[PDB]
Structures are given as C-alpha cells and as structure tokens.
Amino acid sequence: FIVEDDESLGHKELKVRKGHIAKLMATEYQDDVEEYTWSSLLNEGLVEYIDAEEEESILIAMQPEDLEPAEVDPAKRIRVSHHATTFTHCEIHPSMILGVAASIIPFPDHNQSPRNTYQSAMGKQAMGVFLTNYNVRMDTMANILYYPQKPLGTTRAMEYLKFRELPAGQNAIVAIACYSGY
Amino acid sequence: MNAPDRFELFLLGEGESKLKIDPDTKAPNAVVITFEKEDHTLGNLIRAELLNDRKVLFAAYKVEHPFFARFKLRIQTTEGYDPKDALKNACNSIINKLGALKTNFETEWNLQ
Amino acid sequence: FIKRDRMRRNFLRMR
Amino acid sequence: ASRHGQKGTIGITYRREDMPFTAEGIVPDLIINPHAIPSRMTVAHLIECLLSKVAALSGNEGDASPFTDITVEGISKLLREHGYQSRGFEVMYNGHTGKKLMAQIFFGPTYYQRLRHMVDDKIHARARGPMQVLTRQPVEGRSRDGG
Amino acid sequence: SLHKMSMMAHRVKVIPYSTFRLNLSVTSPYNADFDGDEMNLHVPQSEETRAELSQLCAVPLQIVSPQSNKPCMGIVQDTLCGIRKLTLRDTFIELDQVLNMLYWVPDWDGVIPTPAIIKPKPLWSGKQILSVAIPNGIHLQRFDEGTTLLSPKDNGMLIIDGQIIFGVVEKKTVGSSNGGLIHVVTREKGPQVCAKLFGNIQKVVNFWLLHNGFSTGIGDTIADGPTMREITETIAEAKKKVLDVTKEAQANLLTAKHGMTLRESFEDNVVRFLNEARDKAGRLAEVNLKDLNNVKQMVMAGSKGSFINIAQMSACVGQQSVEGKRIAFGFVDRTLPHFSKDDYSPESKGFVENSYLRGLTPQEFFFHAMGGREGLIDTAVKTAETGYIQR
Amino acid sequence: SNTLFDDIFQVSEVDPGRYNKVCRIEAASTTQDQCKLTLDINVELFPVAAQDSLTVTIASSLNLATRSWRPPQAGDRSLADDYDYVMYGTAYKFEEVSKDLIAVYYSFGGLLMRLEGNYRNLNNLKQENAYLLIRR
Amino acid sequence: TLSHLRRTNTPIAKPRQLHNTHWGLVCPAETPEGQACGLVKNL
Amino acid sequence: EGPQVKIREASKDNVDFILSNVDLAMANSLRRVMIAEIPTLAIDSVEVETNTTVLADEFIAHRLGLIPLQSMDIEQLEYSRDCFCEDHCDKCSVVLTLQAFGESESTTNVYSKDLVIVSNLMGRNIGHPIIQDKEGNGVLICKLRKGQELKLTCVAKKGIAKEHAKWGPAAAIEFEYDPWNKLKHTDYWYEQDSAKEWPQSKNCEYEDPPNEGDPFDYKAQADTFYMNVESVGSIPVDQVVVRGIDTLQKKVASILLALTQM
Amino acid sequence: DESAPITAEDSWAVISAFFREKGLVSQQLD
Amino acid sequence: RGNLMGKRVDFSARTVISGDPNLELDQVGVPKSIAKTLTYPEVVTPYNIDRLTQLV
Amino acid sequence: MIVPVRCFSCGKVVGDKWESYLNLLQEDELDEGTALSRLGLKRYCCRRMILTHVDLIEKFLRYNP
Amino acid sequence: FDMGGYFIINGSEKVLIAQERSAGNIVQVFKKAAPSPISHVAEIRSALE
Ligand SMILES: [Mg+2]
Ligand SMILES: [Zn+2]
Ligand SMILES: [Zn+2]
C-alpha cells in the first residue's frame, strides 16, 4: 500500500479507501461489467510494486489501522507503537510473507520455527487428491486419500490455494493421554 | 498369511480346552487358569464377582499382550475350598444376577 | 472468530 | 503426522470399546503422547485442537490465520458457553474397567495428514538372494531383493 | 550405529503385524525413537556365533556404559512420568487394584504384603507396591539438599532389603544416573536380575498409570493473571535497564573496562540484561505453577522439557540471535524497514517479548525464523563434521 | 501381642504440608516432659485438633509377620478397636540422640513416625515391624 | 505441486542463512533440510 | 429383586435409563457387550457385474458394507462358517443385488432403498435396508450421470461388531456415574474452581447435591448409572439391551458348560 | 462512506483480487 | 570402503520399529513373515532330530 | 468425496442428512449451527463430519465418460 | 484446478526451476584479508543483455 501524507485529515493515510474496495467485491460478485480488477489499482496509483533494493529507501507500516492514525486484552500479543511519522508504505498483510507450504500451518505464529520448517517439508508428501482429473491420467505412483476433509482451523490465505476443495488430510478426534504405554 | 482367524477369538481350538486348569505352586489352594478365545468383558467381571465370595483369599487377572483373546486369571482361596468349585459358585451367580436383571428389565419394558 | 463468505448477500444488498 | 512436525507412526490399534471415552460417549480416533508436547513447543498444535473443537460445535470454521487478534481467552469462553470445560479438557473413562480416570484428558478434533511412508513399502528380508554381477555380492535395492 | 551398544543381540519373539517390536528402555542407546526410523537385523548361521552373540552382545550385559561408567538405559518415558505420581505420599491404592498390580509382576512369590493402613479401609501406599518388583538385598540411600531421615519435603532416596522407605522415585534414582538404582542392582545381582527389574518396573508402573491416566493441555501453559503482571514488570525493568544504558553510551559517558571496545561492552551490557530478565521472568511462571500443572510435573518427573521450555511457552521467548551477536542491520542501519535506522532497541535488533502462548508479531516472527534456521544449519554441519571426525 | 510402647501425647501442632490427606503432627508426653513425637497420617481417617492428649500404642502384633493380609471375619479378638487408629510399618533407624534420650524412626509404607524420649521407656523398640494404634 | 513451481535454486559469505532482505520475498519457513538447507527457497 | 432400570427416555431410536443396584464392571461389560458382540447381518462379499461409475469398485463395495439392515429375526439365521451350505444359502445369508443405471440427463443418485433381496427369507424379518429418513430415501450410495451403469451382486452375513464395525448395531454409548463427584474416583483438575468451570452433569438432577460439610463415605460403591444407548436401526434399542444382556448370559454360561467338562 | 479510511479485514479483498488477476504461477507464465 | 569394510550381506531384514511395554528388555518382536524368510541352519543330532523332522 | 456413510466415532445417521443439510441452506438461508441442530446431530463428533466433508464427486461427474 | 507452469517432454511433466545468480553490472567490494598483497578487491561482472 502507498501511504499518502498530505491528506484532507492533515496527516498520512492510504490512497486506498472503501469505494475502491466496494467495487472490488462488486466485480468479485458479478460472478454490469466494469472489472475493477487489481490492475486498476495500479494505474490508479493505489498500490506500488516494490523490490528489495527499493526497500532500503522506504519506511513501511505493519497494519494500517495499527499505525497510521495517531493515538486491552492480557491475552493479546504486545504490539509496537506508531511514533514513526514518515511512513511511505503499509504492508498489505504481513501473513503474506509465507510460502505456499507455510500458510497451511494453523497459527504458525505460536510454534517454534523449525517445527514449521519440518511441517513445510512434510505436507509435500502428505497424500491427498492432487488433481481432480486424476481418474484419467496414466501417471505412476499417484496416491489418493478416500474421504478428504477440509480442515477446521483454516487460514485466510489457504482459500486461494484451493486447499478447501482438494484437502490433504482428515480432522481426527485426538486425545493427548498416556493411555497404554504404546 | 500371518493373520489369525476370528471365530477362535471365541471358537474352541481342537484338542484345546477353552480353559486351562493349571495348578500353580506359589501358594496353597491358589490356582491360575488360562482363558483361550476371550477378552476383558468376560475377564473383568469374573474378577469382580470373585472379590465378593467370602471364602476367597486372592483373585486377579491380566491380559498379557493385546494380540490374543487370552487373558490369565489367578485364584487363591482359603484352605480346602477348591477354586474350580469356587468358579461355579461365582459363575452360577452372575447368570442369576442377569436372569434376575433381564426379566427385572423385561418387565421394565412391557411397561412402555 | 470465524470464516464468513455469503456477504455477497450483504454486498449485493449493501449495494 | 500433525500439521506441526509431529511425524509419528501407528503404535497400535485398539478397537473401540477399549478406547477410553468421555461422558458424552465419544471415543478418540487417535491417541498421542503428552511427552510429545513439552520440548516441541508445539503450542499451536494445542490451540488448533481447542479451536477446532469450538468450530465443530458452533458450526463455523476456525480461523487459524496467523497475525490475528484471536487470542486463547477469546476461544476459551466461546468453548465454555457450549457446555464444555473451558480448556478443552474433559473427564474421560477408562475403557477396560469402565472406571473414571483419576485425571482429565485433553480432547478435540485436529487436522491430520497421512504420508507415503507405508510399511508395506519398507519391509524386506533376504537369505541368499541374487548376487551382483561384479563382486558376486548380494544385490542392492529393496524392489530388487537387495541386501 | 556409533556405539558398541548400537548393536546388541535380542532374543526373538515372533509376533503378528509387520514392525520390529521392542521394549522402550533400550531406545535410548540406539538413539532411536518411533518417528518412523527403520532398523536392520542380522541372523548368525552357526552355533559359535550365536554363542558369540549371546554371551557378548546381549543387551543385559551392556548396561553400564564403559564409556562414562554409568548405565546407558534409565527408566525413561511416561513410565518415568508414571512412576513419579505412584511413589507420592498423597497416593494410596486399594485392594481390588493393589491386587491386580501385584499379579502383573511375573516374578512374584504370591504374598500380599501388609497394607500400610487398616481400620479404616485396608489401603496401600504406592511405594510399597513398587517395592515388590525390586528384588531383595538392595540397599541404597541418597540425601539431597534438605533430606532428613524424616524428609519434610520428601527429597532423597532410602531403600532397604528391597523395600522403598522414603523419597520420591524419579530420574535421579531410576533414570540413567551415576549411582541410582539400576547401577546398583547391576553390580550386585548381575545383569540378568536387572533385566527383569526393567521389565517389572514397566509392567507395574504402566498398569497403574493406565488407570490413573495422564494428560496435558493449554491450561498447563496458563499462568496466574497477576504473575503475568510481574512478568511485564520484569519486561519493563529490562527496557528501563536497556534504555538507561543506551544514553550512557550516547552521553559519551560509558567506560568499557580494559579489553573490549565501547560497542562490544555495550553489547554484553545489554544482552546480559535481556537474558537475565527473560530468565528472571521464566523463574516466576515456573514458580507460580501448581503441582497440578502437568508440564510442571513432566519437568519435575525429569521425563521431558526443562525450565526453558515452559519459560518459552508462557513467560517469554527472549532474545533471538545469530552468531551469538544480536540480529544484524541487514539493510542499512536497520534489520527491517518497518523501523528507522540507528534503532538498536531490543525489539528492533531482535528481542522477542511475547511467549509462544500469545503469538508472535511479524517482525518478531521473522526474527525468530532467523535463529531457528541458524540452529538447523549448525545441526546439519555439526553432524557432518562429527560423523567424519569420529570416523 | 503387647504394646511395645505407649504414652499420652497431646497434639501440640498439625501441619498439612502440600498434602491433601497428609499432615505433620506434634505431640508430647504428659507423663514425662522430655517425650515427644512428630508423625504423619492421613488426616481424613483421623483429622486433628491442637492439644488433644493422645495415648499412643504400638503393639507389635494383634492376637492377645510372613502373613499375607487377610480380611476379617467376626469377633476377631484383635486389637485397635478400642483404639481409634491403626497402620502397619517397620522401623528403620534407632537414633540415640543424647544421653538416654533416644529416637526411633518408623516408616509405615511411606508414613513417618519419630518418637523421642527416655531409652528406659523405649527399651521395647528393637527392629520389630510394629503397628500403630492411637485413640482419642 | 504448487510450491514446487514457486521453488528456486542456488548452486554454489554465508549463503545458507536467511537475510533480512528476504522479507516477504522468499518463505522464511520452508526450505528442505540437509544438503540444500538455505540454497533452496520458495517464493 | 436384583438391579433396577429406570427407563427415562425412549426415542424411536434412543433409549436412556438409570442402572440401579449394580456393581461396576457389570455396568461396564454390559456396555462393552452392547458395542461388540451383537450378532448382525451386513453386506460382505461384493461381486461386480458391470461398473461404469467413477468410483473405484471396492470403494463402492466398502460403503455397501456399512448399510444397516433389518435384523430382528437375526437368530433364525445361522452363521456363514457354520453353513455346510455351498458357502451361502437361505439358512446362512441374505443375497442382495442392485440395478443402478445412469439414465436421465441430470445426475442420478443412488440409495439403499434401491436394493432388492433375492432369497427365500422364510418370511423372516431381516435384511430390509434401513431408511431412517421420512422421505423413504435411504443412505446415499453413489452418483450416476447420463449413461453410467452399475449392476452387481452382494452377499450379506451374520456377525458381531467386533469383527468389523459394519456389523455394529450400536453407536456412541453415553456412560457416567457419580456425576456428583461424591465418590472421588477423579480429581477435578482446575485453575480456580471445580465448581465454576465444570458443568454439572445432566445427571446431577437424578442424585442429590453432595450435602457437603460431611465426612467421606469411603465405602460407597457405584450403582445407579447413567447410560444412553443409541442404535442405528439395525434393531430398535430395547431389543439391543435384550440382545445385549442375553448375549452376556449366553457368554458366562459357556464357561460353566465347558467347566462342566471336567 | 466511499472515502473512509480502511480496516485490516478489507485487505483480503485487495488480495483476493490480486490472485484473481494473476494466479500463483504468474512469473512462470509471464 | 564399499566392498571390503562394508558390503551388502545376506540373512538380514529391515523395517520400522514400534514401542512395546510387554516385551522383555532383551527381546525383539519379529514380524511373523520376516521370520518365515530369514532362517538359520541346524545340524541333525539324536536330540533335535525329532523336532526338526516335525518342522520339515 | 461422497458423504461418508456413518461417522468414524459415533456412527449416527449421515447418508441421509447430506442433502437434507443442503435444502436447509439454500431454502432457509440457514446458519450451520442451527442447521445440523435441526438435523438432529446434537453430539459433535458428527458435528465434525458433515461440517467438513468435501463433496468432490460433483467434480468428476463433469467429465465426459 | 491445474495451473500449467511447465512443459511435457517425452510425455512427462518437467518443470524449470528458478535458478539464481549474482546480478550483472554491479560494482562490488570485498576484502581479502588473506596475507595476499590485495587487501581490497572491487569487481564488476559486466554482461551484455
Ligand atoms: Mg526418528
Ligand atoms: Zn448357509
Ligand atoms: Zn460423529
């Protein structure tokens, strides 16, 4: 996102606002035809593509509402302050710094990092249903779970990964007990 | 190929007593008896009843290892009170408790 | 604390 | 394996009536071992199992998206109201004696993955198989009757 | 396979279903666990080898490691968790049960000991039952801090004739210690007896654990809402103790003592403050727990975890690190752009002041990935150097 | 058969250290000023009040032991019935604390008894696996 | 199948570590363990 | 008389009761009987005539296992093994077959109710597939579009749930006692208050409050239990307990019988 | 309103477009 | 290395391991199959000739 | 795929609830928690199954055969 | 649900992986604190597009 500093409020905010978003789900929910697609955000100067070299030069914000307006649960993680004036960008959403593999872990922000790394490797040999057309491919060594189940603790990302239509496991009623030694 | 059948989880093996009347030597008028082809339900009862006869010194059982329908059962009585003939006196009794219960539930039901 | 989708019912109505 | 690097295997199978059970009559699919937790830090594996329980009660889908405000306390009270112990714990009954269990059990659903590494692919034994060409040694390779 | 005792000669019990199947307490030497590891087997073909195997490479013979003159096989897992609860004073066991537990021990004479309580309600105490499996003759005693022949907080060990008398059986006694039990039986009655001892102590303590059950759960990671306050106070003093120091350097009014630069001394000045504060916190959370709190038991049982684990769960995660230095200014003068430059502040350079319970904040999370990998690389190489070196 | 040792012991104090059933007791002879006791018990089955003068009996056996515990029948002219409370254990330490001040150390199955007093009163206490019988 | 397509590679300072600059560019979490820890990394 | 059974609720298909005046393992093993050794018919061997469908064969044949069947007159059927018959007959089994066709243009479902018995029941009352929906559409088996066929033959046999869940007459069994924790077989773990965050059993009505401020009747034993059986429709619930107990009676009496072979 | 400043939960809208725009193989297909 | 200090040998088996409390500290469970393939010769003597004959 | 026949843990009646489940949603604009409720699934091991099935076969059927 | 991203060679799904390289046309400085007489090395790996 592109912070904007000279703004009607007399301080910084985002060039993106509600109407923009409104037409989005509007265009999303065609599915008349105006197609307020991602591209439009660009040529409207809404969000700016940014690379590594460029980052050296800027000062980004974690979450907009978190930070941009100048200004509680004990169970909440403790969050940093908005002292920083000259923000020029705000992150789209930080949970978008994870690979395909990571954003299938529930709550990857509560575990111990190598666990994730272990998890990252593991799904890639979790069996599941790799591709719906499967009945007609003549591949070798394809493995298909029977009654795949969409998980419970999903993750706002994973929808995009269409996991919830080709899931790779089952919810199971597990009990953490020292039952019989075995 | 390595898989044992399933009737003889209850079907008597041939030339094999369903039980095994085995004297033990560790205690007088004690005994250990081997049960082919069954499981806790049969077992655990047969203990509990045997903790209520008064003429019994000791009674306990275990399943050695999950994979067979055998557990083992150990009775010790007071002197001159055979544990075989302490089984009947137990076992006769349970059916009594059921032929008591069942009909004392049969007539609990025609009431519906 | 949940996932809600049909707000197309809202958004097409809110529109 | 769980979704957190708890790759484990199947110790053993217990048909249902041996599985320890709760008052409600549920019986766990699958039992893991508390010593799995402590030095795996696999806290998220707990919270999922909690949240997943709440979801299957309410009907929603637990949002396990990371950097979200959704604390534990929030999840907890939500669980409580549905009539369960706040921390997902439950009374459970041993399945052999049909007795109470002198301590209470963690309990919920939780997403599990299966993995390729089935045993029937990993077993083989060899007593005078076929030798190599070169050193007349027993051949290698599991599919090939290797040594 | 890089012990002598990485290969031993087990007796064969032919079973059903298609895994290799083995008793746990020998899983420590193979450094093996059941997360899928495979294992090879070899069958000798002529008598001498069988004799050569049996009389040398049998497991029971291999129990004191000639490596560091102590046993290489404690009683280590949930059993070691299970055994703890059992030998507690608070515990008592009743006839119906005491009966069965005794039957399990297969070496058993057939003599019901006296219950430690009659009138009312004949009733045993765990320690006694356990004293069945232990063979006679044993004498063993160890006096911890504050162990007295009365033992008010129930420390130490004292066993006589094969009769536990006081103390709470645990790792330091039945694990793989210096001169805990298994060491002693071995020397006294040879291995063969000790082999049975491992068997029986497992058949009992499991059985009693089965019907006692044991579990864990998030609650075990929740602390007293108040003591959470103090954690935060200890968090605070640090930042104070951190912020204070910082100006002292910028005031140019800092002295590194002779040997290290201004900045390097500034580092040790800081990072100490962080670790100690984190540790100063974890202490409290660990202290605040109940004897109920299962993980607090697991650690007290010595079977898993340690102070650090729980301190990382509930108290705080504390400073991440690469190369032992703090996180480094990766871009110019700032690790991550979401911060300005010259910002050395603990949270910027890569402190972590939540705890695994209450989630990690993107900057923190990223940071915590850094060190988490650094371990992995190190693990990878530190093996490959070791494996080669040892070769 | 016989009381190996008896005397009154007023409950001077009771401390329930972290234990749900189990407590630390302090009692002393009325008869002789120097005879004392700290002993554990399961309170439930005999819970406790400060300054209860407790006469205390030990009585190495029952009739008036290489013996698998047996369930009573009837009219078993045992002991401990006119006594309130009973256990089973064995000594493990004959500590001679001073001049004829002695102490013994009885664990009962994990339950800890520590007398102290005059040897001369305590002559009867020699490595018998004794019982414990307190009333009132 | 997906992540595979968004893999990278790096044949062969310390190029196995996880530099600040990888923020949001390559996954701070996923990397196969062993010989290629670090040198394989997914977008 | 012996133990007592206060039947509280009876759904068409669920039976609750309190099990009064009874020892514990008794209560248990009545239950584990209920789950495990209730003889029952169910589809086992699955010949396939013709499968166009998208499902792998046994994947069908699998679920064809778990289709509950009328099983009142089950005892008038004897077991497969005990059939000297040519491996099945009207004495041992029921043979069902199926004629499913993807004819219409919309997707065409499949249900149990599309099954046909093909064997001389001797008028028996077993095997009629179980339709616990009003609409007379039973279990969903499979989906057919335009132009997919399924013809097949099936043999169903007697058996008990232990041999394969399919033979289960029983579903999840409620079980509780001492709902009031008066017995102390269990220690309520807690952070603050067993009272506060431990919902009282439904059953806590049925037995008094703990009238606390009282000494502990250590000698209290368990009886007056709280169970809620729940069948599938393989047999209605009252016939389960009947078949449940009579089984256990038929069990112990076996021991004595062979015992009498001293 | 139409010019109102945004809330986090919006962004998922923004994102879901981005993928609808591109997909996951983008640089490959590009 | 690959063919003198170490080599592919016969009379071997390998699989995954599973814990078990009910096995004696020196025991090992062998999958009933594996045992059927591995073997070990034995010499007829007056003693085992009986049993051996029966095995055959 | 297809709507497993009865649940792994409980085993209560699912191979009927399936489409009944649906009409509820479309016709009654009805929430899930409410839905499974008036489906008569008061336990939750079941309140797992149907809640997280995936009816895939409604994809395969698209293919010409 | 497929997404392409790849080829088929002799009928088998191959995939080009991103390889990675140093970027061309970059001035770069290092040290060489090896005792060699060259205590700083600036480089550039010129490439023609
Ligand atoms: Mg392993
Ligand atoms: Zn027949
Ligand atoms: Zn269910």
Side-chain angles (χ1 to χ4, degrees), chain K residues 7 9-11 43-49:
Chain K
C7 182
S9 310
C10 57
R43 65 168 63 255
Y44 80 84
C45 64
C46 302
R47 296 292 299 274
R48 181 272 329 273
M49 291 285 328

Side-chain angles (χ1 to χ4, degrees), chain H residues 39 121 126 215 255:
Chain H
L121 306 197
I126 70 172
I255 310 307

